């Protein structure tokens, strides 16, 4: 019953592979729905064609800024921002999908895929999914990152949608 969405990842335009995510709509329905809808593009905007603009190996990959491509943009399907839905789920290890934000109740479209346990984020970022298939592809993406987060090649979501 929880939805599954996929990203097909490209590196400098060359296909890398597919990552799929389970979205925890049972626990965080509003947050899950935002990500789902941005992944299908059904509202007229979304993730297709957008980049990962900050990848720090041993920490996380961050994406979802489809308006400014650098961490300063994005918007949700509910408006510019929306509230922190709950903090039921924790950052338990690699593969966790969590919302980026700029303070309390400022969730937009940006998210990060953890590649480490990041327990210091618990109660401050809303966890709403996990990698289901293709964690190996996330690990491959991580190799293009750097300590300061700049990527050495352009990592894009070449296609995305619901499975």
Curated annotation (Swiss-Prot):
Modified residues (N-acetylvaline): 1
Domain of life: Eukaryota
PTM annotation (Phosphoserine): residues: 76
Annotated SUPFAM superfamilies: Cyclophilin-like
Gene3D superfamilies, sorted: Cyclophilin-like
Glycosylated residue positions: 107
Catalysis performed (reactions): [protein]-peptidylproline (omega=180) = [protein]-peptidylproline (omega=0)
Resulting phenotype, residue 120 to E: Loss of peptidyl-prolyl cis-trans isomerase activity
InterPro entries in alphabetical order: Cyclophilin-like_dom_sf (IPR029000), Cyclophilin-type_PPIase (IPR024936), Cyclophilin-type_PPIase_CS (IPR020892), Cyclophilin-type_PPIase_dom (IPR002130)
Keywords of this entry: Acetylation, Apoptosis, Cytoplasm, Glycoprotein, Host-virus interaction, Isomerase, Isopeptide bond, Nucleus, Phosphoprotein, Rotamase, Secreted, Ubl conjugation
Boundaries of every PPIase cyclophilin-type domain copy: 6-162
Compartments, as annotated in UniProt: Cytoplasm; Secreted; Nucleus
Regulation of catalytic or functional activity: Binds cyclosporin A (CsA). CsA mediates some of its effects via an inhibitory action on PPIase.
Gene Ontology biological process terms from the UniProt entry: activation of protein kinase B activity; apoptotic process; cell adhesion molecule production; cellular response to oxidative stress; endothelial cell activation; leukocyte chemotaxis; lipid droplet organization; negative regulation of oxidative stress-induced intrinsic apoptotic signaling pathway
Impact noted for substituting residue 106 to A: No effect on peptidyl-prolyl cis-trans isomerase activity. Reduced interaction with BSG/CD147 and ability to induce leukocyte chemotaxis
Residues annotated with Phosphothreonine modification: 92
Its EC number(s): 5.2.1.8
Family affiliation: Belongs to the cyclophilin-type PPIase family. PPIase A subfamily.
Subunit structure: Interacts with protein phosphatase PPP3CA/calcineurin A. Interacts with PRPF19 isoform 2 (via N-terminus). Interacts with isoform 2 of BSG/CD147. Interacts with FOXO1; the interaction promotes FOXO1 dephosphorylation, nuclear accumulation and transcriptional activity. Interacts with integrin ITGA2B:ITGB3; the interaction is ROS and peptidyl-prolyl cis-trans isomerase (PPIase) activity-dependent and is increased in the presence of thrombin. Interacts with MAP3K5. (Microbial infection) Interacts with HIV-1 capsid protein.
PANTHER family named among the record's database cross-references: PEPTIDYL-PROLYL CIS-TRANS ISOMERASE, PEPTIDYL-PROLYL CIS-TRANS ISOMERASE A
Function per UniProt: Catalyzes the cis-trans isomerization of proline imidic peptide bonds in oligopeptides. Exerts a strong chemotactic effect on leukocytes partly through activation of one of its membrane receptors BSG/CD147, initiating a signaling cascade that culminates in MAPK/ERK activation. Activates endothelial cells (ECs) in a pro-inflammatory manner by stimulating activation of NF-kappa-B and ERK, JNK and p38 MAP-kinases and by inducing expression of adhesion molecules including SELE and VCAM1.
Listed name of the protein: Peptidyl-prolyl cis-trans isomerase A
Origin species: Homo sapiens (Human)
